[PDB]
Amino acid sequence: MNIKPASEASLKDWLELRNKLWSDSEASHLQEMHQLLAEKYALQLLAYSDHQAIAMLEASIRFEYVNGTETSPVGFLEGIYVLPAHRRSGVATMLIRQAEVWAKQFSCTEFASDAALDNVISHAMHRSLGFQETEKVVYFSKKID
Amino acid sequence: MNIKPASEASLKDWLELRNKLWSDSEASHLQEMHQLLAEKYALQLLAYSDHQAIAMLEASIRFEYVNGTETSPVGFLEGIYVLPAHRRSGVATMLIRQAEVWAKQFSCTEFASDAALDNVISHAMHRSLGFQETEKVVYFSKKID
Ligand SMILES: [Cl-]
Ligand SMILES: [Cl-]
Ligand SMILES: [Cl-]
Ligand SMILES: [Mg+2]
Ligand SMILES: [Mg+2]
Structure with a gap:
């Protein structure tokens, strides 16, 4: 088991793991x-086993208010995905604590995250990772003119 | 009738309208x-009529990702409050309007807002201001160390 930060050579591995986490085009x-590789406050970690990417974690540092938090800035989990086969092997735990370390470096005392209201699978994963639910919100948007 | 930005001369008027939107002590x-007054990316508008403050609006500019939005940066409604007697004046609409113009100076094309899942009368208020629901989200938090 090995954890590396993502890079230009890690791009293909990262992508196909990212492809399964979020629904989007390859171009997007x-x-x-x-642009995440060139960001100061963005963390991209890849987990390897037998020279094969099996999981990934993306995180960031948030300076703007995060719903449910009490400090600022805070660590934020953007997303974490583990291959359906290498699941139940405690790799998500490994990635998340190294993310906490990374955020601890910037003197963050609090790690936040969000999930859609109906994604019970992710809700369970968050609880298994040490998170407690804070609040539930409804988002709105509107075009200027 | 008259909309004016909050000022140090209008603190008390701003205060009496803000506490009944966020329960907190006067000192805090x-x-x-x-700090908001000195914050370039923050907006504080007070609405006047009959020489009294009947409404207030607070908004900000978000460069970090906001749930539901497609662009960055975006304008963000922090809170809007109108005296119950004046909730048929269109004052809220005008306030939103003046906030969107303000966000235009930062090249924002989207105006986002959030609300508690349980605050159903706030959802109606958003909808009558042109806001459309985007995402329902649950938040999590976790102390580092
Ligand atoms: Cl996730
Ligand atoms: Cl989700
Ligand atoms: Cl009233
Ligand atoms: Mg999330
Ligand atoms: Mg809100």
């Missing part, structure tokens, strides 16, 4: 992925 | 107030 993924 | 309100 790779565009989002490229 | 005033402290966040004094």
